[PDB]
């Protein structure tokens with residue numbers, strides 16, 4: 182009976198900041214951060230493997246995209262099962278917030294690597310098949326009750342990457358942000374994007390504007406999330 | 414419980430296709446599962462189109478395509494084997510499903526070989542193994558084997574037999590690739606010296622059949638052994 186909620190949005194939208202705010206507000210509220218965040222960093226063999234392929238992807242995305250995308254999605258699924266069958270036990274009003282989803286894996290990141298030619302046809306169709314299957318064999322219990330879209334302009338995100346001062350992100354272009362921004366807008370706002378996941382097409386969505394700094398002034402955002410939660 | 418599942422293992426062109434085509438005629442309670450890869454050799458389906466494409470590139474450039482090929486082949490094998498459980502041998506008295514190869518040849522014969530030939534780098538190989546571990550962990554007793562039949566043939570036999578089958582992309586297959594695959598087959602199924610990461614495999618019954626002798630119009634003795642093997646599982 183744990184409520185599953187995806188937190189979605191562009192690079193440096195403030196997803197991590199937001200989720201770390203939410204888990205501290207209730208004893209019923211828990212967070213699963215995404216694998217890619219964990220990799221970008223006495224450390225596990227997923228880190229080991231995650232470290233290498235993220236680096237490999239930066240040199241040569243047209244060689245490594247499929248391997249990376251395949252591994253990122255398994256790593257997410259495992260983690261999401263780990264918290265769902267353990268953690269939050271056994272809350273009165275349990276809610277698990279997922280940082281991004283297997284849908285963002287596929288329809289944001291994997292799709293954009295295919296469109297920019299870092300995956301060929303065969304890789305993209307093997308990926309979608311593998312995706313459809315990995316999720317239907319193992320990921321049933323990962324269907325989302327709702328989605329929270331943190332909406333920021335592509336410009337705020339690039340500025341937010343600068344504010345976060347990580348050396349390796351510094352060369353991310355605004356057009357790359359625009360592609361991902363547009364892809365988010367057509368999946369989550371316009372709802373033009375048709376997935377192979379029919380139930381998604383009518384999952385409730387809460388769209389929040391995080392252009393303006395919320396780190397010291399988040400209560401109105403938290404109010405909107407609590408209202409959205411009761412409505413499910 | 415309650416379909417018995419027996420995998421047929423052996424080197425390339427040892428004679429697994431020929432022997433399952435023989436076995437499956439002899440009892441309506443016996444079915445077979447052709448291995449997806451052997452199918453990918455030949456409007457076609459999604460998988461078959463991907464398979465043939467990923468196979469040719471694999472041939473053309475194994476160090477690029479080994480990780481991709483091996484995951485698609487194994488995912489597709491699990492798919493074909495799970496369907497068979499479902500669509501097959503619903504009500505029959507003693508159901509037996511004969512898999513042409515298994516999830517364990519995918520990894521410990523082929524992917525492993527490919528790693529050993531530097532066709533997959535360390536991170537690739539480790540990623541493959543991670544995925545293979547977890548994924549078979551999820552099924553448990555369901556695809557898990559009741560028995561292996563090993564069809565053991567020397568590489569010369571296999572080499573000659575590749576000649577007899579006469580496939581274009583196959584005459585390239587060098588004698589020394591065949592010898593290495595033999596090594597791994599002997600170690601896993603004959604001398605039982607392969608460490609592996611699935612507990613029950615140490616226990617699983619294995620019938621070895623010497624198949625160096627042509628057996629096409631002369632296979633009763635081999636079949637008799639199989640019938641005797643089954644009545645112990």
Ligand SMILES: COc1ccc(-c2nc(CSc3nc(N)cc(N)n3)cs2)cc1OCCF
Pocket residue numbers: 221222235236239347349350352353354357
């Ligand atoms: C089309 O051009 C790009 C598209 C995407 C990128 C991205 N870079 C990243 C940073 S990868 C990274 N590695 C780390 N080790 C740590 C970390 N925080 N981030 C994410 S998206 C960067 C791009 O331009 C950089 C080319 F050198």
Ligand SMILES: COc1ccc(-c2nc(CSc3nc(N)cc(N)n3)cs2)cc1OCCF
Pocket residue numbers: 215217218235238239242250253254285286287290291293294297299357
């Ligand atoms: C030089 O060109 C690139 C360099 C790096 C990238 C990278 N993208 C990433 C992010 S891929 C990703 N997939 C996910 N499924 C999730 C997630 N958080 N990130 C890391 S490095 C992507 C690049 O090309 C993108 C082409 F628009």
Ligand SMILES: COc1ccc(-c2nc(CSc3nc(N)cc(N)n3)cs2)cc1OCCF
Pocket residue numbers: 453454455468469472580582583585586587590
């Ligand atoms: C180290 O050298 C090799 C080792 C193994 C091979 C192999 N070829 C194959 C068959 S390639 C094939 N492609 C197809 N499209 C169809 C089909 N039946 N077979 C299996 S293993 C091929 C090798 O070299 C290719 C030409 F020397």
Ligand SMILES: COc1ccc(-c2nc(CSc3nc(N)cc(N)n3)cs2)cc1OCCF
Pocket residue numbers: 448450451468471472473474475483486487514518519520523524526527530532
């Ligand atoms: C040019 O070098 C190669 C060319 C082709 C191969 C091929 N192996 C295969 C089959 S590997 C296989 N993996 C499986 N998982 C299952 C299965 N039945 N067969 C097709 S093409 C393997 C080659 O190996 C190079 C040195 F290991």
Ligand SMILES: O=c1ccn([C@@H]2O[C@H](COP(=O)(O)OP(=O)(O)O)[C@@H](O)[C@H]2O)c(=O)[nH]1
Pocket residue numbers: 190191192193194195196197198199341342344345346391393394395396
């Ligand atoms: O309202 C905000 C939200 C985020 N940030 C900063 O912007 C960067 C991106 O935030 P985060 O890493 O949480 O974004 P994510 O990539 O997780 O969506 C970080 O330096 C944050 O501390 C900020 O200054 N104000």
Ligand SMILES: O=c1ccn([C@@H]2O[C@H](COP(=O)(O)OP(=O)(O)O)[C@@H](O)[C@H]2O)c(=O)[nH]1
Pocket residue numbers: 423424425426427428429430431432574575577578579626627628629
């Ligand atoms: O007793 C036998 C078994 C097989 N073959 C031939 O050897 C080749 C390889 O056999 P098969 O396709 O069964 O090998 P697999 O790859 O399935 O092990 C084929 O052309 C068969 O006709 C044979 O001459 N006598």
